[PDB]
Amino acid sequence: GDIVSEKKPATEVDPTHFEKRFLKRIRDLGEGHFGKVELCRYDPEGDNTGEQVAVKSLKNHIADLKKEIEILRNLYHENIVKYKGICTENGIKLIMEFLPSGSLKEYLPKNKNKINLKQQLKYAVQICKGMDYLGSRQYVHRDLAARNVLVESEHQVKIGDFGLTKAIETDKEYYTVKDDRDSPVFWYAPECLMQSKFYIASDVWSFGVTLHELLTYCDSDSSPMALFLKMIGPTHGQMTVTRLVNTLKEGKRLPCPPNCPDEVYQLMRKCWEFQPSNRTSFQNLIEGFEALLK
Amino acid sequence: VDPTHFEKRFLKRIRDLGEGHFGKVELCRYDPEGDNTGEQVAVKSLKPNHIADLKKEIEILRNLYHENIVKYKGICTENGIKLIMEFLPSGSLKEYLPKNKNKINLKQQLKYAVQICKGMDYLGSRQYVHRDLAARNVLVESEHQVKIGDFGLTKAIEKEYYTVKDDRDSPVFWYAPECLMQSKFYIASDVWSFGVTLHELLTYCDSDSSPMALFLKMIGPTHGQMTVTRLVNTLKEGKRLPCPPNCPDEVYQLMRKCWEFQPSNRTSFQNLIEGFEALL
């Protein structure tokens, strides 16, 4: 008889599946731990009219990127960056919505005239809401910093990278850190630096530092790293972290940002109690800021 | 004629003997007759700022007189200065022990331990903290005699301790918890470093059993900037270097007395001398 062929079934289109051949690289948006994010135009018509997207690719760690994809795919919150889809090659890429204003680290220095204290406190509430949503799903972020917070508009921010995000086991209080060589130490709580234990309260400490960055408009000369290095000394090399732990044990903290009212600084100080159990919660911070806003 | 004054024009560089913190030591022949018959000497000069530190080390060594402390011979003045010491051809215990295992038994290792303790006790009695006691800094005078051979980090105690400022190149795996956590160096901190030096001696300075290799296996070797806090956490938990192979429990128990978490609970050098002498 004639040569046989397979009956072709109805070919359905998945809007979350992005073809590699149409993902056209524009520029880098940031280097993460296992991956890197690039601005791409997904252009299936090949005429430079396609939608712009943020694409996360591996820089070995495919299992970690797959885990980050599955976390983000299932988060639905207005202050959390939107998952758009994937690009499958065993390799995989994470496709997200692109926010042209970029991160608060890039946005704030260029927009000081436009952003007053009231707008800074609204961003602080939005970061707390996104973080509380994450905590309620039993996740620890581990990388909350202004460079990871994106600007949706002048009125809206979104948490924008989940490269270090880990699930806390049910009925347990923290995640035990193994990979720590590239830890953002100047945003880390003492229990993270001393025992490699990450709690939801550890994310609250990182929020306090993120709030300090927002209030200083992310100026590089007032950055948490620049300020802590001036306090402890910048020539300690491998001894930097123990000197940082010793300074924190002594009760020393980042100073009140210029023009920051004491009532805002007092909420910031509640994020920095030495013991995780004595720290404020994200829900208590939302109430505190809302009271200062109205 | 000053016999402690060495003319630069007569010092012939031969080879390097070791790199320190602010300086480096070189083997030289001091040859004023220009016929290669001159005496061989160890010369410490600054690494090409820190002249004040080298001058301080020279003045410390010049005034130490002990059979288990390397002999000061003199200086070479240019502001510049070089430290002249006697040369020990057998070099350090780090170089000597791996090549002489057959010749050095437990009894000889315990005699070296007594000698290191005596030299260290002499230093402590002059109110100095060494801060760099390790097998690589102990020289072999002969099969029967060792001498502490570098004083690059040696500081006078005013008070019970010296507060450390320059610490980026700290030999962390030889350091007591108070040094790692608070940058405070006591005489008891030198006792902790001696315990680690004793472990090196007992393992014949083999690189695969070195205090760094053993601690890195315990804590993990991929922690980068987090290594020291992971080391502090392991020490806080009560974890210590294991008993060297073939080391009797009675020797290991003396070693463990150097490693009490609190400096005040640690053995003294005088108590270690008595302990080893009893075993000998």
Ligand SMILES: CC(C)N1CCC[C@H]1C(=O)N1CCC(n2cnc3cnc4[nH]ccc4c32)CC1
């Ligand atoms: C994770 C940390 C270690 N790195 C340090 C440099 C910025 C940060 C990063 O890699 N990102 C990913 C890209 C982000 N980004 C910047 N502009 C963006 C615009 N749109 C975006 N959509 C998803 C991410 C994203 C954007 C900033 C945070």
Ligand SMILES: CC(C)N1CCC[C@H]1C(=O)N1CCC(n2cnc3cnc4[nH]ccc4c32)CC1
């Ligand atoms: C101080 C530490 C950080 N360094 C790491 C390498 C060895 C050590 C050193 O610089 N020295 C100085 C030279 C010493 N040395 C080696 N053979 C020697 C032979 N004779 C010597 N007389 C005085 C020192 C000396 C000798 C060993 C320790």
